[PDB]
């Protein structure tokens, strides 16, 4: 109840913090992925809204 | 606008056949016997779900 610790010196610290900000922008060709070069497949895919 | 567009898209999804003969349940029931009609109704149910 009557003792205190006081610093008599200091230190300058440089720390590193890494934060993600953005990610990969991707695009998908639905017809090419599902029905790549196929007219019958494309016509059937039109049925799915 | 996003919420309204989501609801409108959900409504417009009801016109899709999803591979069935028709997108209308009443037409499927009227044009087919129960056992065959069950298959088309299953396709519509899966699509709408
Ligand atoms: C406070 O700490 C610094 C280091 O963090 C001390 O500086 C060092 O002092 C010694 C002896 O004088 C030298 O040999 C080192 O080269 C010094 N280091 C640097 C980076 O300068 C400083 O003396 C301390 N101060 C007190 C009052 O203790
Ligand atoms: C202060 O601390 C001492 C021991 O560190 C303790 O015996 C004493 O009771 C404390 N003071 C009070 C008023 O209690």
3-state secondary structure of A37: coil
Collapsing DSSP to helix, strand or coil, B38 comes out as: helix
Looking at the complex, does the CB of residue B11 fall below 8 Å from at least one CB of chain A?
A: no
DSSP B10: H
CB of A48 within 8 Å of a chain B CB? The answer is yes
* A9 pocket-lining for ligand 1 (C-beta < 6 Å): yes
Asked if residue A44 lies in contact with residue B43, where contact means CB atoms within 8 angstroms, the answer is no
> Which tokens go with B27?
């037409």
- Residue B41: both structure tokens together: 């109704």
Fill in the DSSP letter of residue A45. Answer: H
The alpha carbon of residue A17 and the mean position of all alpha carbons in its chain are separated, in whole angstroms, by: 17
Q: Half-sphere exposure of B42 toward its Cβ, with a 13 Å CA cutoff?
A: 6
Q: How far is CA B14 from the centre of its chain?
A: 5
Answer whether A47 sits within 8 Å of B19, measured CB to CB: yes
């Amino acid at each position: 109840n009557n003792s205190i610790a006081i610093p008599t010196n200091f230190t300058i610290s440089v720390t590193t913090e890494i934060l993600p900000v953005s990610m990969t922008k991707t695009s998908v060709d639905c017809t090419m992925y599902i029905c790549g070069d196929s007219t019958e497949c494309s016509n059937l895919l039109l049925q799915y809204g | 606008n996003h919420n309204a567009q989501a609801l409108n898209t959900l409504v417009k999804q009801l016109s899709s056949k999803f591979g069935a003969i028709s997108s209308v349940l009443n037409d499927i029931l009227s044009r087919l016997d129960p056992p065959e009609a069950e298959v088309q109704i299953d396709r519509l149910i899966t699509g709408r779900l």
